[PDB]
Design a protein around this ligand. Structure first.
Ligand code: SF4
Ligand SMILES: [Mg+2]
Ligand SMILES: [Mg+2]
Ligand SMILES: [Mg+2]
Ligand SMILES: [Mg+2]
Ligand SMILES: [Mg+2]
Ligand SMILES: [Mg+2]
Ligand SMILES: [Mg+2]
Ligand SMILES: [Mg+2]
Ligand SMILES: [Mg+2]
Ligand SMILES: [Mg+2]
Ligand SMILES: [Mg+2]
Ligand SMILES: [Mg+2]
Ligand SMILES: [Mg+2]
Ligand SMILES: [Mg+2]
Ligand SMILES: [Mg+2]
Ligand SMILES: [Mg+2]
Ligand SMILES: [Mg+2]
Ligand SMILES: [Mg+2]
Ligand SMILES: [Mg+2]
Ligand SMILES: [Mg+2]
Ligand SMILES: [Mg+2]
Ligand SMILES: [Mg+2]
Ligand SMILES: [Mg+2]
Ligand SMILES: [Mg+2]
Ligand SMILES: [Mg+2]
Ligand SMILES: [Mg+2]
Ligand SMILES: [Mg+2]
Ligand SMILES: [Mg+2]
Ligand SMILES: [Mg+2]
Ligand SMILES: [Mg+2]
Ligand SMILES: [Mg+2]
Ligand SMILES: [Mg+2]
Ligand SMILES: [Mg+2]
Ligand SMILES: [Mg+2]
Ligand SMILES: [Mg+2]
Ligand SMILES: [Mg+2]
Ligand SMILES: [Mg+2]
Ligand SMILES: [Mg+2]
Ligand SMILES: [Mg+2]
Ligand SMILES: [Mg+2]
Ligand SMILES: [Mg+2]
Ligand SMILES: [Mg+2]
Ligand SMILES: [Mg+2]
Ligand SMILES: [Mg+2]
Ligand SMILES: [Mg+2]
Ligand SMILES: [Mg+2]
Ligand SMILES: [Mg+2]
Ligand SMILES: [Mg+2]
Ligand SMILES: [Mg+2]
Ligand SMILES: [Mg+2]
Ligand SMILES: [Mg+2]
Ligand SMILES: [Mg+2]
Ligand SMILES: [Mg+2]
Ligand SMILES: [Mg+2]
Ligand SMILES: [Mg+2]
Ligand SMILES: [Mg+2]
Ligand SMILES: [Mg+2]
Ligand SMILES: [Mg+2]
Ligand SMILES: [Mg+2]
Ligand SMILES: [Mg+2]
Ligand SMILES: [Mg+2]
Ligand SMILES: [Mg+2]
Ligand SMILES: [Mg+2]
Ligand SMILES: [Mg+2]
Ligand SMILES: [Mg+2]
Ligand SMILES: [Mg+2]
Ligand SMILES: [Mg+2]
Ligand SMILES: [Mg+2]
Ligand SMILES: [Mg+2]
Ligand SMILES: [Mg+2]
Ligand SMILES: [Mg+2]
Ligand SMILES: [Mg+2]
Ligand SMILES: [Mg+2]
Ligand SMILES: [Mg+2]
Ligand SMILES: [Mg+2]
Ligand SMILES: [Mg+2]
Ligand SMILES: [Mg+2]
Ligand SMILES: [Mg+2]
Ligand SMILES: [Mg+2]
Ligand SMILES: [Mg+2]
Ligand SMILES: [Mg+2]
Ligand SMILES: [Mg+2]
Ligand SMILES: [Mg+2]
Ligand SMILES: [Mg+2]
Ligand SMILES: [Mg+2]
Ligand SMILES: [Mg+2]
Ligand SMILES: [Mg+2]
Ligand SMILES: [Mg+2]
Ligand SMILES: [Mg+2]
Ligand SMILES: [Mg+2]
Ligand SMILES: [Mg+2]
Ligand SMILES: [Mg+2]
Ligand SMILES: [Mg+2]
Ligand SMILES: [Mg+2]
Ligand SMILES: [Mg+2]
Ligand SMILES: [Mg+2]
Ligand SMILES: [Mg+2]
Lengths: 137, 208, 148, 122, 82, 7, 99
RNA sequence: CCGAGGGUAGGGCCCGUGACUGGGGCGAAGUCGUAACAAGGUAGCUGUACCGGAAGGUGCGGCUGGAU
RNA sequence: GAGGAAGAAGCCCUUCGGGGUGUAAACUCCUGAACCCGGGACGAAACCCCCGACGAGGGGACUGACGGUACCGGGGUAAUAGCGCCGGCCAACUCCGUGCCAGCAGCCGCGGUAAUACGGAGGGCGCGAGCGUUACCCGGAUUCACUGGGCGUAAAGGGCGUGUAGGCGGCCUGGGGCGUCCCAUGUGAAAGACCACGGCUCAACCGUGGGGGAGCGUGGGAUACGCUCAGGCUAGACGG
RNA sequence: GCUAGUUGGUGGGGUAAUGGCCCACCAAGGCGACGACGGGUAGCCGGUCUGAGAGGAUGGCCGGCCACAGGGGCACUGAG
């Protein structure tokens, strides 16, 4: 397994599209810092440490919209789109003046700095750039 | 130079009454109120559905033939407004209005821009005291456009200033009929002038 | 009420012994210029009947398009198979910068300033559908906040 | 391709091939006529097109088209040629400019005169 | 020697000089060392002459040589006032 | 080029 | 400031001279990925005190000879023959690249 | 001593050209047959091999992108 | 330039009623490009001499190729228009001639006896002392795809393994600070570009000022991520 | 695949000055898939053209640097 971060986002993206209540991911501190921001920004209900067959996992609780009407009653997504930016193949580092505005404010950009993992708005207000982790809306 | 040709065919093509002559524009001798169909052998045939390109071209030729300005000067003005700040639609109109030969018409010194040009072109005009014989002079706020002293006494200017005692002049302008003076107050807003022209369709013509 | 624009009128043909038996199709977009748009594809043995059905189907299917001062709230990429439409919000002075098919849908939406680009297959039918699904997917800060 | 693959190999700039090689980067090129004959065109056209085989100042010898009705061109005629092919005459890639050197203009033209080297009649 | 002279800019029949420090072997409109002011000989604007005077004295102190008609425009700007 | 040559 | 570099020693086979193999990392100007690039410098070892596998620092200096423009400034590590093998295996792989 | 270059001798690369020769492309209405598309009238394609005016045929093995 | 007929002649189309060029012309009056006369520059104040002190500072004199040019003043004649195009793309249509001819052509295509596609004409469209053509560059071309493409059948997975360099790499803790991020600082000439103002009557052109980046040098800091070093784990992998 | 002044050393010459730049000698080294060697083309830059940008193309006029002065070699004079 080459990218635990790309795995997590993808592990979530597949669960939200079959409308799972939760989905477990292998546990790591850096993943927690990422999920901490998805919960604080409302994309997920939150997460809680668990053990599966004696192994540390992170159970993530997912959010969706209300039951829609019409011929397809599947709720709108709370995570419409979650996508890796920086990757092991090409790492992506932006300065503070280069941080992109995701979806014109309706989305966030998670990115790791030497002050921690921050959202696009947190970095710009705190004034630091860093490795662009992903984008979510 | 300028178009210099028959001018009633312009209105008959554009489907709209453009005021390019003078008094005749208001008489029943107006070709537009007399044969309001395009010139030539086919003008009375039934128009087929125009294309989107046709519609935008027609707007542009409309606005341009209003001012009697050549396509070079017309677009160089258009491109200037594109670069400047704000809405390009208004600014392009404002700069068009800021032309001296248009002011001299808009101040009633002549009954047609085409005649206002010859007024400017023969020098019968001044700006802020100085003679200015350049129809393209961009008039700024505060400039005092007046008739040349050596030309104040001339039948055409009097008869034009006479019939100007009647009419009022736009909010962005000022005029003193007895002293043949005039003042450019400000850059016209979009609503301050109602041309039969959808300026966005002229923007869209160049965005191609 | 709603305003109608005819995007496309084409003549398709089937075959049988004796030759080609034709049929006509009509893309018609409809809208109020205040935030309601509708797309309909009408197919009939003659041109006026097809333009009729097209407007009818068009009013049967509409979209909210949350305008914000004449532009759209956010940029959006939508692909309706091989056809891709880009919608980017623009400043109040810009204008509707689009091909004829999206422009027709955006002007009847009431969009007065926007940036667009057609990518991939520029089939007007599928560009039209791709434009509608894009509008249909536009959300506001209100929609977003209310979801999270 | 992977980003590493692009680091290794990169993208290949597409090159464009001139469709007027005999010109050798010139807008026009002078020559002399060797064969002045007519050629039939390919499907679905039928005609007797007027073609000159021209020996150039650039070392090349090519077949040029002689546009317009009637021409004064024969062997040893000096001729200027321009780019532009005749779609329906395979191998003709150039046109003769009329009204230049020993190629007279078209007699009694009125429309599109500058494209045929004919001066304005009184 | 290093000198202080006029590098004619502007356009034809529209002279506009920059009082400038450059090497005497440099070309007239060439790469100078520092600009110490401009000068409009045709007096077409309220301030057709301008000199730093502080800098014009530095280069003067270290050995720069003005031109004959550059010496004036530094005199007329009071560079020499004792 | 002596003297006769080969070529 | 005289440029200061760091690299291993891949050759001791010269008198008063060792070959120092410096490498550097930078992002690809177009494809962004961080890529490696190395360069050998012929460094001055006048006391002949440096040997293979030594990771050392070299400093820009006035020419000792043609091609010799750096002086060894200080030792850093020692016995990094694991890096030297990487260099030698590569040069060795070149025999399989001819025709 | 070195030395522009001249000279002798022998190599390498490139360009132009050459009796003749090889196929290639293209060219409204030429001559021969009908290989392929339908089970195309021997299912087709195929690598190889051999043969034959020509398409092609046949052998060995493979494929279904083969009908029923 | 303004005026100027239900609207001349000529030429074009017609259903023979009429329609078109067209307020276009004529014509009337107004203006006055050129040209004629007169005046006539900014660019040029220093070197120099004078007093003082061969200085600071005073005051003085000579000098213009462009040029009798610009410009100002007075007079003063209605005074060059051409080029492309009108099948679709693409804005602009009718008549005759021609009959797969002569010819057109950027692509699709036109021409075989009723051609809006050839040639002329009338009309029409577009530009205008220019208008077209050829050549070449970027764009459309997301058609070398970093932004921003693909590979079952459209062009595209290597016949299959093994493996060198290389690229990439699991969970936890700490050291360093290389990448990366932040702040300060040096450099980033002028011109150009950009914004503002101003000078040639405007403009082009030209002058003045403002705003700066990236990259690299230096100094300080941050340590999440990537890197390296050290220590531990068992979920990958290998073994019994 | 390339290399014999080739790569390093010592001594010396030479120059304003470092250096195989040059000579004597000793050592056997130097470079190359991160493209050596070879072939082709090109003066480089500020900038210019285009482009949504990323990029592409270009380097005439103006400014900076380099190179050459019929083709070559050479030194003299000299701050150069
Ligand atoms: S207004 Fe009537 S008269 Fe004046 S120009 Fe237009 S048409 Fe001719
Ligand atoms: Mg960066
Ligand atoms: Mg311009
Ligand atoms: Mg007068
Ligand atoms: Mg454009
Ligand atoms: Mg599609
Ligand atoms: Mg797709
Ligand atoms: Mg395509
Ligand atoms: Mg909504
Ligand atoms: Mg034909
Ligand atoms: Mg010749
Ligand atoms: Mg002859
Ligand atoms: Mg061509
Ligand atoms: Mg023509
Ligand atoms: Mg033609
Ligand atoms: Mg002059
Ligand atoms: Mg010099
Ligand atoms: Mg010898
Ligand atoms: Mg020799
Ligand atoms: Mg020799
Ligand atoms: Mg000799
Ligand atoms: Mg030889
Ligand atoms: Mg042969
Ligand atoms: Mg026969
Ligand atoms: Mg058969
Ligand atoms: Mg058979
Ligand atoms: Mg068979
Ligand atoms: Mg068979
Ligand atoms: Mg076989
Ligand atoms: Mg047999
Ligand atoms: Mg078989
Ligand atoms: Mg098999
Ligand atoms: Mg079967
Ligand atoms: Mg008139
Ligand atoms: Mg009548
Ligand atoms: Mg009439
Ligand atoms: Mg008549
Ligand atoms: Mg009549
Ligand atoms: Mg003077
Ligand atoms: Mg003197
Ligand atoms: Mg005295
Ligand atoms: Mg005179
Ligand atoms: Mg006068
Ligand atoms: Mg007078
Ligand atoms: Mg008079
Ligand atoms: Mg007249
Ligand atoms: Mg044209
Ligand atoms: Mg048609
Ligand atoms: Mg066009
Ligand atoms: Mg048309
Ligand atoms: Mg016949
Ligand atoms: Mg005939
Ligand atoms: Mg044609
Ligand atoms: Mg073309
Ligand atoms: Mg006939
Ligand atoms: Mg006919
Ligand atoms: Mg027919
Ligand atoms: Mg016709
Ligand atoms: Mg045509
Ligand atoms: Mg015709
Ligand atoms: Mg002009
Ligand atoms: Mg031209
Ligand atoms: Mg464009
Ligand atoms: Mg591209
Ligand atoms: Mg191209
Ligand atoms: Mg290509
Ligand atoms: Mg291609
Ligand atoms: Mg890509
Ligand atoms: Mg593709
Ligand atoms: Mg396989
Ligand atoms: Mg093989
Ligand atoms: Mg490995
Ligand atoms: Mg690694
Ligand atoms: Mg890791
Ligand atoms: Mg660091
Ligand atoms: Mg600069
Ligand atoms: Mg600005
Ligand atoms: Mg900058
Ligand atoms: Mg820095
Ligand atoms: Mg530091
Ligand atoms: Mg020595
Ligand atoms: Mg040497
Ligand atoms: Mg020796
Ligand atoms: Mg030896
Ligand atoms: Mg290297
Ligand atoms: Mg060469
Ligand atoms: Mg050259
Ligand atoms: Mg060269
Ligand atoms: Mg592009
Ligand atoms: Mg630009
Ligand atoms: Mg270049
Ligand atoms: Mg140059
Ligand atoms: Mg010159
Ligand atoms: Mg230059
Ligand atoms: Mg030489
Ligand atoms: Mg010579
Ligand atoms: Mg010589
Ligand atoms: Mg020489």
């Amino acid at each position: 397994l080459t990218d635990p971060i790309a795995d997590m986002l993808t592990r979530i993206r597949n669960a939200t599209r079959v409308y799972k209540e939760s989905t477990d991911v292998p546990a790591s501190r850096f993943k927690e810092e990422i999920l901490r921001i998805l919960a604080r920004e409302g994309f997920i209900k939150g997460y809680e440490r668990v053990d599966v067959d004696g192994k540390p996992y992170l159970r993530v609780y997912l959010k969706y919209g209300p039951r829609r009407q019409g011929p397809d009653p599947r709720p709108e997504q709370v995570i419409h789109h979650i996508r890796r930016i920086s990757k092991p193949g090409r790492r992506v580092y932006v300065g503070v003046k280069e941080i992109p505005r995701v979806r014109r404010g309706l989305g966030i950009a998670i990115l790791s700095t030497s002050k921690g993992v921050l959202t696009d708005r947190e970095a710009r207000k705190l004034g630091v750039g860093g490795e662009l982790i992903c984008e979510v809306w | 130079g300028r178009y210099i040709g028959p001018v009633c065919r312009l209105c008959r093509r554009e489907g709209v009454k453009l005021y390019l002559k003078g008094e005749r524009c208001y008489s029943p001798k107006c070709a537009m109120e007399r044969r309001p169909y395009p010139p030539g052998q086919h003008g009375q045939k039934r128009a087929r559905r125009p294309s989107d390109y046709a519609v935008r071209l027609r707007e542009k030729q409309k606005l341009r033939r209003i001012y009697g300005i050549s396509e070079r000067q017309f677009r160089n003005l258009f491109e200037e407004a594109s670069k400047k700040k704000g809405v390009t639609g208004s600014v392009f109109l404002g700069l068009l209005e800021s032309r001296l030969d248009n002011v001299v018409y808009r101040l009633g010194f002549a009954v047609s821009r085409r005649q206002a040009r010859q007024l400017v072109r023969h020098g019968h005009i001044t700006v802020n005291g100085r003679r200015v014989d350049l129809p393209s002079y961009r008039v700024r706020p505060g400039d005092e456009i007046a008739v040349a002293e050596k030309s104040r006494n001339l039948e055409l200017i009097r008869q034009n200033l006479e019939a100007m005692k009647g009419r009022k002049v736009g909010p962005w302008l000022s005029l003193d009929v007895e002293g043949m003076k005039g003042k450019f107050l400000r850059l016209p807003d979009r609503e301050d002038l109602a041309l039969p022209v959808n300026e966005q369709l002229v923007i869209e013509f160049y965005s191609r | 009420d709603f305003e109608e624009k005819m995007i496309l009128i084409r003549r398709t043909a089937r075959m049988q012994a004796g030759g080609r038996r034709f049929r006509f199709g009509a893309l018609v977009v409809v809208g109020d210029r205040q935030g309601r748009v509708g797309l309909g594809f009408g197919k009939a043995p003659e041109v006026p009947l097809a333009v009729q059905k097209a407007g009818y189907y068009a009013r049967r299917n509409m979209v909210e398009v949350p305008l914000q001062n004449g532009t759209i709230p956010h940029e959006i990429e939508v692909e309706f198979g091989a056809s891709k439409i880009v919608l980017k919000p623009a400043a109040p002075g810009t204008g509707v910068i689009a091909g004829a098919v999206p422009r027709a849908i955006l002007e009847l939406a009431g969009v007065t300033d926007i940036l667009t680009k057609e990518l991939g297959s520029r089939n007007p039918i599928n560009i039209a559908y791709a434009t509608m699904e894009a509008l249909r997917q536009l959300r506001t800060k209100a929609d977003v906040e209310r979801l999270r | 391709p992977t980003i590493n693959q692009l680091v290794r190999k990169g993208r290949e700039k597409v090159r464009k091939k001139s469709k007027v090689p005999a010109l050798k980067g010139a807008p026009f090129r002078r020559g002399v006529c060797t064969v002045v004959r007519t050629v039939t065109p390919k499907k679905p056209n039928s005609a007797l097109r007027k073609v000159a085989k021209v020996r150039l100042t650039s070392g090349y010898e090519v077949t040029a088209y002689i546009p317009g009705e009637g021409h004064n061109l024969q062997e040893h005629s000096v001729v200027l040629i321009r780019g532009g092919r005749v779609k329906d005459l395979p191998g003709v890639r150039y046109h003769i400019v009329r009204g230049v050197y020993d190629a007279a203009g078209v007699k009694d033209r009125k429309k599109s005169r500058s494209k045929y080297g004919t001066k304005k009649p009184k | 020697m290093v000198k202080i002279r006029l590098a004619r800019f502007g356009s034809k029949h529209n002279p506009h000089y920059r009082i400038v420090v450059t090497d005497a072997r440099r070309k007239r409109d060439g790469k100078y060392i520092e600009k110490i002011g401009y000068y409009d000989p045709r007096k077409t604007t309220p301030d057709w002459l301008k000199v730093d005077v502080e800098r014009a004295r530095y280069w003067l102190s270290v050995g720069a040589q003005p031109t004959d008609t550059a010496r004036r425009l530094l005199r007329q700007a009071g560079v020499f006032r004792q | 080029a002596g003297x006769p040559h080969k070529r | 400031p005289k440029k200061v570099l760091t690299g291993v020693v891949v050759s001791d086979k010269m008198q008063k001279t060792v070959t120092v193999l410096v490498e550097r990392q930078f992002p690809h100007p177009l494809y962004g990925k961080v890529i490696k690039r190395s360069k050998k410098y012929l460094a001055h070892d006048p006391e002949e005190k440096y040997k293979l596998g030594d990771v050392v620092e070299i400093i820009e200096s006035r020419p000792i000879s043609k091609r010799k423009r750096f002086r060894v400034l200080r030792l850093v590590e020692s016995g990094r023959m694991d890096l030297v093998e990487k260099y030698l295996i590569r040069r060795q792989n070149y025999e399989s690249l001819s025709k």
